[PDB]
Design a protein around this ligand. Structure first.
Ligand code: NA
Length: 205
């Protein structure tokens, strides 16, 4: 039974609704944040808050200690420049999970990893390159890794009626940020997605 989880990137749009749903689901949530004031002051607050940076190996190590599973929602703060913050952040998380014996990691990359590499728009190639590096870091770690590769993440409401496509592209090109967080929590209750790539999508319009 998974009870204690750590969430990386909980201050982002998708991370905030994932944190809110995880607290309401009864999980003991630990978050790593740059600033504690970025967390919601009222309502769903996490059980444990570590103030630090994901690129600091020691900060990640104390966040992963004693956890049952890890949710990774790392991004590039809306910067299309060539970067390694997501891949290097993933290497710190993987190193900490191996040392402490944590096996379950659910990580969000991008649906572009399911596309023809030549069809990826050139403007988004730099960010996609680091998503590939992070995915390879997690794929080669040997942990129970659920690769979430969502399409466009919108502001649609929480439905729970989305479609989950395994190891391929789904029929819709949009997933709500609430349904995305809902699905990543669902991956903590089952192992049927372990080692697979998941494409959540739904038709809201
Ligand atoms: Na933060």
């Amino acid at each position: 039974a998974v009870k204690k989880i750590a969430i990386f990137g909980a201050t982002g749009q998708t991370g905030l609704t994932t944190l809110a749903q995880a607290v309401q689901a009864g999980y003991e949530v630990t978050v790593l944040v740059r600033d504690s004031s970025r967390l919601p002051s009222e309502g769903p607050r996490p059980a444990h808050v570590v103030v630090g940076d994901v690129l600091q190996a020691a900060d990640v190590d104390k966040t992963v200690a004693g956890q049952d599973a890890v949710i990774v929602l790392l991004g590039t703060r809306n910067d299309l420049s060539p970067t390694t913050v997501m891949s290097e952040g993933a290497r710190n998380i993987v190193a900490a999970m191996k040392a402490h014996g944590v096996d379950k990691v659910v990580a969000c990359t991008s649906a572009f990893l399911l596309w023809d590499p030549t069809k990826v728009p050139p403007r988004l190639q730099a960010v996609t390159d680091d998503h590939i590096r992070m995915h390879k870091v997690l794929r080669e770690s040997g942990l129970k890794y659920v690769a979430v590769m969502p399409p466009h993440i919108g502001d649609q409401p929480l439905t729970g009626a989305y479609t989950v496509t395994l190891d391929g592209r789904g029929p819709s090109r949009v997933i709500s940020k609430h349904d995305l967080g809902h699905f990543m929590l669902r991956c903590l209750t089952t192992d049927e997605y372990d080692g697979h790539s998941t494409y959540p999508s739904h038709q809201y319009q």
